[PDB]
Amino acid sequence: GRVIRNQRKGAGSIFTSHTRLRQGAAKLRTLDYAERHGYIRGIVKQIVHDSGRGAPLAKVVFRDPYKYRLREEIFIANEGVHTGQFIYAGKKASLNVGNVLPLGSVPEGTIVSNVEEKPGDRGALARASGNYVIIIGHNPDENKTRVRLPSGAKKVISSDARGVIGVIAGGGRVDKPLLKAGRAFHKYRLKRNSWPKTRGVAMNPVDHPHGGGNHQHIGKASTISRGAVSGQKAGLIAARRTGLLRGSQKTQ
Amino acid sequence: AQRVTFRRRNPYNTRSNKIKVVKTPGGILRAQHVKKLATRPKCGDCGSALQGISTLRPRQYATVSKTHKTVSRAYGGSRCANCVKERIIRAFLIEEQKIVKKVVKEQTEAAK
Amino acid sequence: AREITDIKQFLELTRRADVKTATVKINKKLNKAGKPFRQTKFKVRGSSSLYTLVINDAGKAKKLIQSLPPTLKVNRL
Amino acid sequence: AKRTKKVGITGKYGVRYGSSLRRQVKKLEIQQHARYDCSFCGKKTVKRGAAGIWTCSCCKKTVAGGAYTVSTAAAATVRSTIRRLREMVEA
Amino acid sequence: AKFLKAGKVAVVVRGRYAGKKVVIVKPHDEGSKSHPFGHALVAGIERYPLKVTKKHGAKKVAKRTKIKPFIKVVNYNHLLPTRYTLDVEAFKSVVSTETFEQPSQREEAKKVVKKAFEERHQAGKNQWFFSKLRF
RNA sequence: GAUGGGGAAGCUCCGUUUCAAAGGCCUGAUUUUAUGCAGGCCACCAUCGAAAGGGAAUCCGGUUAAGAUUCCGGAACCUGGAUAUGGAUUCUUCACGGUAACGUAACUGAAUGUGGAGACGUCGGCGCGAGCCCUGGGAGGAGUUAUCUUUUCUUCUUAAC
RNA sequence: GCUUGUGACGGCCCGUGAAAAUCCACAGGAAGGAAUAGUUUUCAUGCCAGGUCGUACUGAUAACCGCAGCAGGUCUCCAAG
RNA sequence: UCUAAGGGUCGGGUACGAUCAACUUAGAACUGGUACGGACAAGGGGAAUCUGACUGUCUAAUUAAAACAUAGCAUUGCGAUGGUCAGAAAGUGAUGUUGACGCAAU
Ligand SMILES: [Mg+2]
Ligand SMILES: [Mg+2]
Ligand SMILES: [Mg+2]
Ligand SMILES: [Mg+2]
Ligand SMILES: [Mg+2]
Ligand SMILES: [Mg+2]
Ligand SMILES: [Mg+2]
Ligand SMILES: [Mg+2]
Ligand SMILES: [Mg+2]
Ligand SMILES: [Mg+2]
Ligand SMILES: [Mg+2]
Ligand SMILES: [Mg+2]
Ligand SMILES: [Mg+2]
Ligand SMILES: [Mg+2]
Ligand SMILES: [Mg+2]
Ligand SMILES: [Mg+2]
Ligand SMILES: [Mg+2]
Ligand SMILES: [Mg+2]
Ligand SMILES: [Mg+2]
Ligand SMILES: [Mg+2]
Ligand SMILES: [Mg+2]
Ligand SMILES: [Mg+2]
Ligand SMILES: [Mg+2]
Ligand SMILES: [Mg+2]
Ligand SMILES: [Mg+2]
Ligand SMILES: [Mg+2]
Ligand SMILES: [Mg+2]
Ligand SMILES: [Mg+2]
Ligand SMILES: [Mg+2]
Ligand SMILES: [Mg+2]
Ligand SMILES: [Mg+2]
Ligand SMILES: [Mg+2]
Ligand SMILES: [Mg+2]
Ligand SMILES: [Mg+2]
Ligand SMILES: [Mg+2]
Ligand SMILES: [Mg+2]
Ligand SMILES: [Mg+2]
Ligand SMILES: [Mg+2]
Ligand SMILES: [Mg+2]
Ligand SMILES: [Mg+2]
Ligand SMILES: [Mg+2]
Ligand SMILES: [Mg+2]
Ligand SMILES: [Mg+2]
Ligand SMILES: [Mg+2]
Ligand SMILES: [Mg+2]
Ligand SMILES: [Mg+2]
Ligand SMILES: [Mg+2]
Ligand SMILES: [Mg+2]
Ligand SMILES: [Zn+2]
Numbered sequence A: 001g002r003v004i005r006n007q008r009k010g011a012g013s014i015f016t017s018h019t020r021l022r023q024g025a026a027k028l029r030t031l032d033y034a035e036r037h038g039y040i041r042g043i044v045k046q047i048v049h050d051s052g053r054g055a056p057l058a059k060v061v062f063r064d065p066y067k068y069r070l071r072e073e074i075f076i077a078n079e080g081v082h083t084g085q086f087i088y089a090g091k092k093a094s095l096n097v098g099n100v101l102p103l104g105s106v107p108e109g110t111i112v113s114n115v116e117e118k119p120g121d122r123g124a125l126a127r128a129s130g131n132y133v134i135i136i137g138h139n140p141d142e143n144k145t146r147v148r149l150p151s152g153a154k155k156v157i158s159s160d161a162r163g164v165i166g167v168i169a170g171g172g173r174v175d176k177p178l179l180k181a182g183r184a185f186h187k188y189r190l191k192r193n194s195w196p197k198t199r200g201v202a203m204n205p206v207d208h209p210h211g212g213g214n215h216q217h218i219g220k221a222s223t224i225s226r227g228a229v230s231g232q233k234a235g236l237i238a239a240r241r242t243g244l245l246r247g248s249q250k251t252q
Numbered sequence B: 001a002q003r004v005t006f007r008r009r010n011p012y013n014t015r016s017n018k019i020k021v022v023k024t025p026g027g028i029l030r031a032q033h034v035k036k037l038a039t040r041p042k043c044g045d046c047g048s049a050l051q052g053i054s055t056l057r058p059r060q061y062a063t064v065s066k067t068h069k070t071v072s073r074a075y076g077g078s079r080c081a082n083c084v085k086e087r088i089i090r091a092f093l094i095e096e097q098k099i100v101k102k103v104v105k106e107q108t109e110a111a112k
Numbered sequence C: 001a002r003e004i005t006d007i008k009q010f011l012e013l014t015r016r017a018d019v020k021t022a023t024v025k026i027n028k029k030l031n032k033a034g035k036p037f038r039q040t041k042f043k044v045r046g047s048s049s050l051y052t053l054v055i056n057d058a059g060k061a062k063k064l065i066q067s068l069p070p071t072l073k074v075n076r077l
Numbered sequence D: 001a002k003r004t005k006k007v008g009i010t011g012k013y014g015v016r017y018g019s020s021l022r023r024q025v026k027k028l029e030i031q032q033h034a035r036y037d038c039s040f041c042g043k044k045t046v047k048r049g050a051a052g053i054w055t056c057s058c059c060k061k062t063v064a065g066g067a068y069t070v071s072t073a074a075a076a077t078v079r080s081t082i083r084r085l086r087e088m089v090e091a
Numbered sequence E: 001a002k003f004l005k006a007g008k009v010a011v012v013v014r015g016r017y018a019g020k021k022v023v024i025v026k027p028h029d030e031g032s033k034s035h036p037f038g039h040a041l042v043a044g045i046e047r048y049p050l051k052v053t054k055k056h057g058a059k060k061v062a063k064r065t066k067i068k069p070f071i072k073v074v075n076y077n078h079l080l081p082t083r084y085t086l087d088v089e090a091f092k093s094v095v096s097t098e099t100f101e102q103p104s105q106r107e108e109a110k111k112v113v114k115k116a117f118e119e120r121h122q123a124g125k126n127q128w129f130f131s132k133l134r135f
Numbered sequence F: 001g002a003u004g005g006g007g008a009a010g011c012u013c014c015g016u017u018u019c020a021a022a023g024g025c026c027u028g029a030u031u032u033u034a035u036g037c038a039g040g041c042c043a044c045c046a047u048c049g050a051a052a053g054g055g056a057a058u059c060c061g062g063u064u065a066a067g068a069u070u071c072c073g074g075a076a077c078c079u080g081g082a083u084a085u086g087g088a089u090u091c092u093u094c095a096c097g098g099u100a101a102c103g104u105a106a107c108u109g110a111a112u113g114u115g116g117a118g119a120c121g122u123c124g125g126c127g128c129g130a131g132c133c134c135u136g137g138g139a140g141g142a143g144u145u146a147u148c149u150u151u152u153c154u155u156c157u158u159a160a161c
Numbered sequence G: 001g002c003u004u005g006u007g008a009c010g011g012c013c014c015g016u017g018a019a020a021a022u023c024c025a026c027a028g029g030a031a032g033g034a035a036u037a038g039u040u041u042u043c044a045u046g047c048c049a050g051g052u053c054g055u056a057c058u059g060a061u062a063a064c065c066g067c068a069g070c071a072g073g074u075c076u077c078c079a080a081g
Numbered sequence H: 001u002c003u004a005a006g007g008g009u010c011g012g013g014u015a016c017g018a019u020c021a022a023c024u025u026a027g028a029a030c031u032g033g034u035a036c037g038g039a040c041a042a043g044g045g046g047a048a049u050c051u052g053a054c055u056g057u058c059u060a061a062u063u064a065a066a067a068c069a070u071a072g073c074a075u076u077g078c079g080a081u082g083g084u085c086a087g088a089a090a091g092u093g094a095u096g097u098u099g100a101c102g103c104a105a106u
Helices: A005-011 A033-037 A181-189 B058-063 B082-108 C007-013 C058-067 D008-013 D019-033 D073-090 E058-064 E103-121
Strands: A040-048 A057-063 A070-076 A086-089 A100-102 A111-113 A133-139 A144-148 A154-158 A162-165 B019-023 B029-033 C002-004 C021-030 C036-045 C050-055 C073-076 D046-048 D053-056 D062-064 E008-012 E021-028 E039-047 E068-075 E079-085
Touching (some): A040 A070, A111 D073, C002 C007, C007 C036, D008 D019, E008 E039, E039 E103, E068 E103
Parallel strands (some): C002 C050
Antiparallel strands (some): A040 A057, A057 A070, A100 A162, A111 A162, C036 C050, D053 D062, E008 E021, E008 E079, E021 E039, E039 E068
């Protein structure tokens, strides 16, 4: 039969990200000479909504060390940072909400955000609204630092990898019921074309592994193997358990 | 009762196709096309429409004398006076307080 | 387009290098509430715009017309 | 004259969606539309303007905050944590 | 003390001359029939001597170091009083009430004050005063 | 959607500022002379894509069998290029005035920097403008009139600049 | 009153509602410039030039699409008592 | 055919007067072949069972529904040297101007 929906997604025709209104990509400062020997100061000049994103952006501007001009950056605003605030960035920066520092220079327990996966990658970890990473240890020989990501995962990255002190703004966005179809409508209208969702169990066999039959039903385990092939992977991929989760979760 | 027609080929009601009805000396109603309204220039520091300064559409400013584009203070047509009080005050004290910090840590480097 | 009201400035106009042609119009008009009177507009046509001077006094009117440059090609009415 | 025994702002949804959802919405609505205190100048004039953004009418500071409330519990504890942790570093 | 007195330097903080540095030459601590407010009478400098360097030859130095002065009646609430202070003897009489009112008397006044300021400037007295406040 | 490139037997596919030695301006240097080098910049690296988006500047009256914001009449405005005369400015060289918001007929300003404008959703009531609608007086033309109606209809307009 | 324009406000969002050409301003102060006479075209007035293609008419119960002068279809402005 | 209530503008030393202009609402008489939202315009109502919560969606041209969607609930995969997906290949591509309050899959 036909190419199913989740395969058509990849050719990104009607499926590319709706991008027109976006502020620009959020990114730490390029890791230059200032930030890795000293600190450099900026002013947050505006904190601002970014369509499709949930957390507001901070627009923060710095002087240029090598040329007379301003260079502006787009940060993701940590909660509590504000317009006119001075933002300090560098190895020898001080430990306050809003500043950006290398995880090597912060005590364990430090609560950071937008952290780099490798030094210089201008930020990758915990950027969504409300999210953060905790520093839970250091290993000064072979300078690594060990952190706990929002997913629960613990991971060890370079101590020069940078992050910004505090948590990302907009927390609890998801506490509030969407209430109606229409609010989801406008939600995804500014993201990508993933809404609404026909159940494969409502299609015909041409369309889906789940399609067809004189009652609606999956007709075979919907836990599909990792090694399955395109066209096959619909449902609980690689599922190592299944069913209502009883009892406390949380990584021991 | 006298009705009216657009005067350019564009039939649609777009921002660039605003119309105003007018009585001619012939004693008839006629459409006139109307340019979009100019907005007031704004202050670099605060953002308020800055007083003193004429408001035209941007190219219409190169048709008009220099005094429609300034007030006669420092940062004239650019920042909004109160915003420049602030600038002067803040400059001064900080340049002053800089003298202060130097001589204080000069004493730290001589008594310790 | 323009209007002029300094009698002195007007004679200065009427002799400018481009001012070739000019005209005098006469209007019957009423005075205050009661009677009417004789208004006369002096229009010099300079190159880029038309200056017009309204002398409201029939007296000043006559004498002004005599002062009119004897090469100016005045259109009377 | 009390206009509603309990739906409050939530009366605009009529009978739809189910009382429970309307409850949850009610709580965060009241939060987000509320007027808050401004730390910098002291007038209670901080109103929200899109999730996470909190601006002051007078005086004009804008502070990144919670999706529906100026300060988030998590934010707040984190703040003092940082207070605490930094304290060690000069001491 | 009543610190707005005989030679207090101050920064003009509104008006045309805003940000320029002046000297109070005669204070009117309270009132005038006109000017109904605390005001001082100042000798400001409108066009600062431009920095000068070694590359700067004979007359280029001459040009660079000419000062355009100004005299102003100005409200107290428009000055930032300065710790620095500059001597005001050579043009005490020059700047006065009667100095203002009638332009010609003003132009005379500035002539003197101008001479006084360029004397002062060379052999760098009051070094601060002859240096643009930058903002 | 070209180009340095990378795939592909190949028709061609990919990429669009990319793993590239990617170019042109301002004036100064010429008084063999016409444009070679002397500065310092600027590294922005195609191009196509809207007759509803952005956008320099025009209006009225008249005129044709059939065109007209396009012709005719009259009155404007913009853009480029030329430039002289007046005015303004200066012996305190680059204007004065006003406490101030700021005023003005003018009132030198390269590199570089920065700010504004262009430039922005939707609904609700409220305030004001325009044109239209309703209406008194008056000056006119029409209609009705056995009877009745100081009556019924209509003209009394003003463009950009 | 009606239509339209516009302002000062107010509601709303896990929706906060283009871009570029282009025009001006400011900060800066390289430079250039007068007294036996200089500076000034962001003030006024003055001079010259503005190419190329479209422009008729229909726009619908007959000028478009439905084999047609087809009861179908096809985007829009003006709007009297 | 009457009555009643609801307004504007003015001068007043440091209680009122005078004037101009609006349908709104309520009450009272009178009157007619008991008619009067007089044409036009304009909701049938009630008690229950089945079924989908709702608004929304589709078989252009025999099915508009109880089907699809939805908010809500729950499960799965993934920390980027990745999950899911594209491509004949590639210094190729979607999600991605993204980062678990996220993207993908039921
Ligand atoms: Mg894209
Ligand atoms: Mg869809
Ligand atoms: Mg579904
Ligand atoms: Mg589903
Ligand atoms: Mg089916
Ligand atoms: Mg199948
Ligand atoms: Mg199967
Ligand atoms: Mg099936
Ligand atoms: Mg089933
Ligand atoms: Mg037309
Ligand atoms: Mg609209
Ligand atoms: Mg003005
Ligand atoms: Mg001005
Ligand atoms: Mg200056
Ligand atoms: Mg190509
Ligand atoms: Mg083009
Ligand atoms: Mg166009
Ligand atoms: Mg257009
Ligand atoms: Mg005509
Ligand atoms: Mg003809
Ligand atoms: Mg015609
Ligand atoms: Mg003509
Ligand atoms: Mg002409
Ligand atoms: Mg010109
Ligand atoms: Mg002047
Ligand atoms: Mg700009
Ligand atoms: Mg802008
Ligand atoms: Mg637009
Ligand atoms: Mg016009
Ligand atoms: Mg309409
Ligand atoms: Mg808004
Ligand atoms: Mg401007
Ligand atoms: Mg040089
Ligand atoms: Mg000019
Ligand atoms: Mg035509
Ligand atoms: Mg026809
Ligand atoms: Mg037909
Ligand atoms: Mg009454
Ligand atoms: Mg009355
Ligand atoms: Mg039954
Ligand atoms: Mg239903
Ligand atoms: Mg329905
Ligand atoms: Mg059907
Ligand atoms: Mg069929
Ligand atoms: Mg139906
Ligand atoms: Mg049917
Ligand atoms: Mg349920
Ligand atoms: Mg390869
Ligand atoms: Zn405040």
